[PDB]
Each structure stands twice: as C-alpha cells, then as structure tokens.
C-alpha cells in the first residue's frame, strides 16, 4: 500500500449526479453551469470537452492516458481545470485513477420534478422515463459527504453563489499570499 499518490496540483472541476448524462435533461442543465464558470473566472480557468472514458485505467489505454496527461499539463501553470465529461455518473467511477477531481453534485431535491422535466422535453425523452431515475436514485443513494460540492438550489444565482464562492475558498487554499 503506497501512502502517497501522484495527483495533479490543481484538481479538475467536474459536475455529476443530476441524473444519467447522455440525455437532453441532464446535459442541458449542466450546460448552463459551464457558461457561468467560463466568464466569472475568465483568465484563471481551463475548460475542456472530454471524449474518452477516463474510468478505465471502448477506448484503449493510450488514448485515455494521453488525455489524463493533458490534465497533468493543465495543473502545471497553477490554474483551474474544468471537465465536460459525458459518461461520469457515479462517485467511485473516478476513484481508481490518479486525478481525484472535484465532485460537484447537482442535487435535484425532489424526484417527482425530474419526470415533469422529462415530459417537458417532448416525446423524445418520454421514451426514457424510468432509465434516468435509476442513477438519479443511485446518486441519491450515495452519501453526500463523499461528494465535494452540493447544489440544491432552483434559481440560477443561488446555485451559482455556491459554485463561485466554494472554489474561491478553494483557490485561496491552494495559493498562499506573498
């Protein structure tokens, strides 16, 4: 058992738990959150779009590790890293690599509202009713203290008052004054 594990110097910010990604419901809720952190922390963030499944160390080892080492490059200049990962739907899905990303957990406080969101997306997402509520339940079955940042706020500004201030408390933790 090694006591120290080579992690990046600035942890990549990730969003998970609203429900299963790969849908019009969960992704378009997160796409609003990537827009807020783009211009609020402009010049001190690196926001990327993730394609290959990084829960593997499908894709081979080389195509994933060359993207993991790109996250290793984005920790060298001591700035924020943000990931648009499209298959991450579990806390322990990213527990075996050497990244340890920031688990921002979007919390839908009421499970009945999700299937009302589902019927607002037309009949395309109305064919995918109970399949989204599975990992919407399983992430709600996971303990909230295992996560990092919890967002239970319906309005934009109240989910974003936590989403800006927590990492601003995290930036001053990483960076000391002169």
């Amino acid at each position: 058992v090694p006591p120290y594990d080579v992690v990046p110097s600035m942890r990549p910010i990730i969003l998970v738990g609203p429900s299963l990604k790969g849908y019009e419901v969960t992704d378009m809720m997160q796409k609003a959150l990537f827009d807020f952190l783009k211009h609020l922390f402009d010049g001190r963030i690196s926001i990327t779009r993730v394609t290959a499944d990084i829960s593997l160390a499908r894709s081979s080892l080389a195509e994933v590790q060359s993207e993991i080492e790109r996250i290793f490059e984005l920790a060298r200049t001591l700035q924020l890293v943000a990931l648009d990962a499209d298959t991450i739907n579990h806390p322990a899905q990213l527990s075996k690599t050497s990244l340890a990303p920031i688990i921002v957990y979007i919390k839908i406080t009421s499970p009945k509202v999700l299937q009302r969101l589902i019927k607002s997306r037309g009949k395309s997402q109305s064919k995918h009713l109970n399949v989204q509520i599975a990992a919407s339940e399983k992430l709600a079955q996971c303990p909230p203290e295992m996560f990092d940042i919890i967002l239970d706020e319906n309005q934009l500004e109240d989910a974003c008052e936590h989403l800006a201030e927590y990492l601003e408390a995290y930036w001053k933790a990483t960076h000391p004054p002169s």
Binding site: V1, P2, P3, Y4, D5, V6, V7, P8, S9, A75, L78, S98, A100, A169, K172, A173, T174, P176, S178
Partner: protein, 100 residues
Amino acid sequence: QGPHMALRKEAERQALAQLEKAKTKPVAFAVRTNVGYNPSPGDEVPVEGVAITFEPKDFLHIKEKYNNDWWIGRLVKEGCEVGFIPSPVKLDSLRLLQEQ
C-alpha cells in the same frame, strides 16, 4: 556538547534558508495521503518547529525535495505555509523504528 553543537546548529539554519527559498518556487507535484501523521520531537526534523501534519486523505503541494527523508511543500488549506513533508521512505523508516 560543545563539539556536537558546531555542526548540528549550522545545519538547522542551512535547512531553514532552504525552507525560506522554496516558498516562491512553483509547485512541482502534489500527492494524495492515505494515513495520518503529526510531527514529533525525535523524527530527525531538520528545522525543529516548522514541520507540518496531515491526517488520512489530505493534499500536499510539494515544492521541492530537501533530502531523502524530508520534502518541502505546503498544505492545501487557507493560510497554510510550506513545511517538512515526510517522504514515503521516511514513512517507511518511522514504522520499523516502532518495532525495533
């Protein structure tokens, strides 16, 4: 005594100057801790007083490597400065002295 204080006290200030000259150095590599540790009086600490402590699952932005038994780096926490990080072979040395 007097012949033992000529070299032991000139090593504490020389390791203190290396400790002051590494705070402005950029962060090389950060580690994820698995166990807990606090500094003790007999840990062969180079500058007695400026060592840091970590519990299980903490983060250490290591700046540089002082020797084979102590690293130099800071705790990821508001206001915390640099400190003496015990190396994994120093963490290998401390447990076997608890048996011998």
